[PDB]
Amino acid sequence: NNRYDVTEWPAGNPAKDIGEVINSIIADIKARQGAADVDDGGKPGAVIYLPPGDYHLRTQVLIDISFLRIEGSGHGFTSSSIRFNVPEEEWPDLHELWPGGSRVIVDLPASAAGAAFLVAREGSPRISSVEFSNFCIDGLHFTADGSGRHPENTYANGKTGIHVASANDSFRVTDMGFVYLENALTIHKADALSIHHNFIAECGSCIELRGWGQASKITDNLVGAGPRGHSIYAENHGGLLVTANNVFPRGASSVHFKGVTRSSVTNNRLHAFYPGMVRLEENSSENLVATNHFLRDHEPWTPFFGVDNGLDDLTGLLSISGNNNSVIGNHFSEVVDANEIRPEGATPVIIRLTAGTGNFVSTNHVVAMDVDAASSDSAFEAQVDALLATEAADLAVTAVLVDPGSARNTILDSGSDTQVVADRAVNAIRATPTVGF
Amino acid sequence: SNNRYDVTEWPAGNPAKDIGEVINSIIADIKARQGAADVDDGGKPGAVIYLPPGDYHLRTQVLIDISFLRIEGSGHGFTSSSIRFNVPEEEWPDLHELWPGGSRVIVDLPAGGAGDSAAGAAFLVAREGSPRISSVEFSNFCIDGLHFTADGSGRHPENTYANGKTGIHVASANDSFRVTDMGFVYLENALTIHKADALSIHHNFIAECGSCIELRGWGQASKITDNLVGAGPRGHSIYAENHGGLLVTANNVFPRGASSVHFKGVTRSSVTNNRLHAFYPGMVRLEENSSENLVATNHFLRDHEPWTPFFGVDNGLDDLTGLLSISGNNNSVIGNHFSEVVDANEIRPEGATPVIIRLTAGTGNFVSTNHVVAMDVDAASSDSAFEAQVDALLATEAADLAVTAVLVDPGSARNTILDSGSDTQVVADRAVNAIRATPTV
Amino acid sequence: PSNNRYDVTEWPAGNPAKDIGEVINSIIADIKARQGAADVDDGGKPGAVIYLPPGDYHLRTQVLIDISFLRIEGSGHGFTSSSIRFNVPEEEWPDLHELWPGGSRVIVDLPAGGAGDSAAGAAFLVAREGSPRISSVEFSNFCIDGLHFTADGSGRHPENTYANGKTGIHVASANDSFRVTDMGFVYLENALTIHKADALSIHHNFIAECGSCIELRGWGQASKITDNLVGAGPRGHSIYAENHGGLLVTANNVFPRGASSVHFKGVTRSSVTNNRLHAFYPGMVRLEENSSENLVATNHFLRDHEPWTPFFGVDNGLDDLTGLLSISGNNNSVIGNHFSEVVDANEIRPEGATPVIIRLTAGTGNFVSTNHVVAMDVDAASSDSAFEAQVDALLATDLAVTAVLVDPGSARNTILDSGSDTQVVADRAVNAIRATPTV
Ligand SMILES: OC[C@H]1O[C@@]2(CO[C@]3(CO)O[C@H](CO)[C@@H](O)[C@@H]3O2)[C@@H](O)[C@@H]1O
Ligand SMILES: OC[C@H]1O[C@@]2(CO[C@]3(CO)O[C@H](CO)[C@@H](O)[C@@H]3O2)[C@@H](O)[C@@H]1O
C-alpha cells in the first residue's frame, strides 16, 4: 500500500542509521514502481513515517523519486543554544538536554555531501511534489572554526538538513523543526514551492533558495539564524511571496534577495540585532516590501553580546539596489545605544537606496530611540525584558538615504525633510507634514 | 515501544467514559520508559497520542509535564451548538444531529475555585524548573464544553458563555508550542497560554467560546495566524498582555467577543491583514502602554447583532469608544478599511457622532491612509441565525452617516494623521499634531 | 470498525484501484449504519476518517457525502505538470521518469454532466438539506486528477482545451466550518466548487492546470482562502466568489492562466490582500455587480505575455482597456498595491490604445491610495521550453499607461498617489484627486 514506518522495516536499524533504513525503503519503492504507464498510472510514490524517537543518521538519504512524503509526529525543538551555555555542572538537574519529536540526528562529516536528505534527479520531467512534514532534524553540535566564540556558539558544522539540488516543482516543507544545522534548508531551482509553518531556529542559515526559481512561497514560519548566515535568502527568483513569517535574531539579515524580481516581502515580523535586515541586491527589481514590522536593537544575551554581522549603522535596516520597487506601509523601530553607533557620530540610516531608478517609498513610520545596551546571562528573561522596555530618549535618524547612484525615485510621507537625505532635483520628495499650521 | 499511542487501543479504563484517565495513564507510561536525558545523544523524545473520531468524555484533567508530546485527532468537529440550543427543544429529535463530533473531547469537569480557572481545563500544561517545557503540539481534534449554565445575567442558560471550563491551559513558561487545526466549542475559555515564546496558534476554528485565545503573563516572538475566531460578549477573541514581537495575521474574526483584538502592554507587534467583524464598539484595543505596534491593512466591520437571541446583548461600550482605540506611543495605523454600518436611532449616547479611531493617550502615533465608510441602516432582527447574518452582510443600500474618523484626546499629542478623514472627520488639536485631511471635492 | 477509522485499501471486497468511489460510498453506508442515534451519552454521530494511502485509484462512481464530520485524507498532493507532458512530443515519453500525477491519487473517470448538471461530473459531491447545515467536513492531502482534457471545437490541441466536464469536489448544500487543505487538483475542468459556505477555510492547497480552480457560489460568509498555489485556464476562474460577505483572500500565489486571478460578483465587506498575482491577460482582479466595501491591499500584480508556444495565441478575450483591476461597486479601498505591466507596445489591443491599470466603471466612494505602477515595453516571444521560458520572462527587465481611469458612471471617488496627473483619467469636478508628485 506504499506506506512505510522506519521502525517496521527489516533492513537496518533506525536508531543506529535511519539513512540506511530510508534508502532501503526508497529502493523498495523503485523496485515495485518500475512502469510509468500502466492503467493511467504506475509511479504514485509513497509515504515514510517516523514515529517520535531518537534516530541517528550516518548515511545521506538520496531522494530521486517524485511524490515521496516523509512525515513525523513532532517538530521537537528545544534551545540547544541555551543549554550549551548553561554551566555543565547544572546539566544533570535539567529535565531534558536534547531536541525530540521525530528526531533525525545528523551524524555526517562536514556541502551537499553534509546534507541529511539530498533530493536530486536529472533528466525529465522535474522531480515533483516531494513532501517533508512534521519531523525534527538536529545537527547536534556546533564546532570550532577559528571565530573564537565557544565551539557551541559558532553556528559551524558543515551539516545541512534538507538539500534539493535539482530543478523541482510543487515541493512542500511543512511543520518541520530544524536545529543546530549550519544550513537548515537549501533548495535550488524551485518552481511553485511552499515552505510553510516550520520552526527553523539556531541554524547558521535557515532558508536558502538558490540558483533560480519561480512562483514560490515562504509563509507562516518561525525563523532564527546565525550572525554569518541567512534567515531567508533567495536568488534569481521571480514571483516569490514571503509573508506572515516571524523572523527573530540572529541572522546576518532577515531577508536577503540577489537578482529577485516581481516578488513580495509583505506582512512579516522581523527582529534583528544588526543593521542590514532586508537586503535587495544585484538588480532586485519590481518587488513589493509592504506592511512589515522591523525591529533593530542590541543583543541582550551575554554569550553573543559582542558578536555582530560586521555592518555599520549607515547600512540601513532596508537596503535596495535595483529598479522600480515599492516600499509601502512598513513600521521601523530603531532602538540603539547612541554611544555605540558606528561610525562615531553618525546618524543611523533606516531605508537606503544605493542604486537603481523608479523606487516608490511611501507611508513608512520610523521610530528611533536611544537606550543603554543591557547584557544578561539568562536568555529568555533578557530577551523578553528587552522587547518590552520602552524607557528611552528620542533619537535623530535618517529615515531615507538616497545615494547619488540611485535616482528618479519617489519618496512620500516617510520622514521630514531633514530625515530624507536625497537630491530633490532628480527625485520626487514629499516630506511627512510637520506638526502645527 | 515506538512512542505512538491510540486512546482506543489502551488496556485500562474507557476513553468513552474518561479519556483523561486514559491519557494520564499513557503519559505515565511515556515517563516510565523515557527516564534518562542523555543516552546516545537523546532519551526523552516524547510521543504522540492519537484520538480517532469519536465521543470521549473527560472527567479527569490531563496533566502534560513533558516536552515533545503531540496530541492529535482526525476532525475539528465543529457544529453550532449555539444555534441548536436556540431551536425549541421539542424539535431536537428531528434534527440530523445535535452535537459536535470529530475527535471529540467532552469536558465534564466542574468549574475551578475563584482564581483557579486552571482546575477547569481539560488539558493543563505545567512544569517548573529548567529548561522550559517545549514543542508540545495539539492538532486537529475537538474540545467541547457541552453546555453554558445560568449565571445571573438574565440570558437563557445556553447563551451565557459561562461554564468555568477551559480547553487547553498552559500555566508554565513554554517554547515552540503549536496549536493547529483544532475545533473549540462551548468553553468559557478555549485556549489560555501563559509565558509563551515562539508559539504558533495556526489554522484553528475557535468559536462559541466565552473567550477564545488569551496569551497571559508575558511572551515573545509568537504568532496567531489563519484562525477562524468568534467569542462571547464579556470575553476576548484574541488577547495578549506583555508580549513583544507578536504577529496576528490572516485571521477571520467574527462576532461576538467584547473585542476582536485586545492588547495590554504589548510592544513591537503587528496586527495586520485580518478580517474583523464585531457587533459592538471597541474592536481593537491597544491599552496600558501598548507601543510601537503596526495595525495595518485590516478590514473592520462594525454593525448591529441581527440574531434575535442576542439582539439586546452587548459589551457595555458606547459609540464614542472607537472601533480602534490606542493608549500608547509610536504605533503605526496604516491602510485599514473601516465599515461603520449602524442604525442612527440605535447610536449611544443619544445623538452622538460615532468615533472610528481614537487615540486616548500617548505620543508619536502615525495614522495614515485609512478609508472610513459609514452608513445609516436599519436594525433588522431575525430568529434564523445564518439567514439573518448573510442578509445583513450583503445589505449595502443606505444613507450616509456622519462619523468622527479620528479622535485625538488631549492626553495624546505629537501624532501624525494623514488621509484618514476630512477636516470635519478629524477631531484633534492642530497645534500639536501633524494633520493632513483627506482631499475632498 | 468501532473506532471510525477506515483505509480504502482494507475495505472488505472493495477494489479502490478499479472504483474507489464505490469503496468510499460503501464506507459511508457503514458509518451511517453504526451512527444512527443523535443523542446518546451527549453524542452519537461523531463522523469518521477515511484514509487513502499513496496509490493510483480510479473513481467510476460519484462519492456522495451527506454526513457531518467526515474527513477524507491522504499522504500526498501528487502534482506533476500533465500540461507540460502532453505537449512533449509523444516519441520522447518513454525516456521520461514518470508520466502521471501521483500521491494519494483519485483519477476521475466520470462522464461529463448533463446540461446544467456539472455536479454530476464531480468526484465528490457533498449534499444534505434540512437542519442543521452539514458541518466540518474535511478534505486533506490527496490528489484529484481528471486525467485528460478533450476536444471542444476551440481548435486547440485536445490536452490544452481545459475541457472535460469533471469536478474534483462539489459542495451543493449550505455548509459550516468546512476545510479543504493540502490538496492537489490537476486536469479538472473545475477543481473545487462550494455553494452556500459559512466559515469555510481553503488553505495550503495546490490547485493547478484546471479550467477553473476555486468557485464559491450562491452566497456565503465569514470564509477564507489562504496560502494556496493556484493556476487556472483562459476561460475559467482562479478564485471566484459571489454574494459573499466577510471573505478573506490572502497569501495566495496565483499564477497563469485563468481568465482572471480574483473575480467577485456581489461580494461585500471582504479583503483581497497580500497576494501575489500573475496573469497573461487583462482583467486580473474583477469586482463586479455591486461589489462594495472591499479592501484590495498590498497585492503584487504582474501582467505580461504568455511565453510558452502552445498557448502563445490563446487569451481571455479582453483588451488592454479593461484594467488589471476593474471595480464596479461602492466604497471599496484600493491601497498599497504594486502593478507591473510588461507588454508589447506594438500589440496593444485595441490598435492605438493606452493600457489601463485600475478602472472604476461604476459606483461611488472608492478610495484608491498609494499604488505604484511600473510599465514597460517588451517584445512578445514564444518558445516551446516551458519552465525555462517562464522563469526567463519573469527575470527579464518605458511604456505610457493610464494608472487610474474613472468612467463617467463612477463618481465621488478619492484617488491619491496612484499616478501622475497624466496617468489619472477622471472628472476633476466630481472626484478628489491628488497626483503622485513628479520630477
Ligand atoms: O524567542 C525566539 C527563539 O529564540 C531562541 C532562544 O534564543 C536564541 C538563543 O540562541 O537567541 C535567538 C533569539 O535572540 C534565537 O535564534 C535563539 O533561539 C529559541 O529558544 C526561541 O524559540
Ligand atoms: O459565521 C461564523 C460562525 O458563526 C456561528 C453561528 O453564529 C453564531 C451563533 O452564536 O453567532 C456568531 C456570529 O454572529 C458566532 O460566534 C456563532 O457561531 C458558527 O456556526 C459559524 O461558523
Ligand SMILES: OC[C@H]1O[C@@]2(CO[C@]3(CO)O[C@H](CO)[C@@H](O)[C@@H]3O2)[C@@H](O)[C@@H]1O
Ligand atoms: O510555475 C507554476 C506552475 O506552472 C505549471 C507549469 O506551467 C503551466 C503549464 O500549463 O503554465 C501555467 C504557468 O504559466 C500553469 O498554470 C501551468 O502549470 C506548473 O508545473 C507549475 O507548478
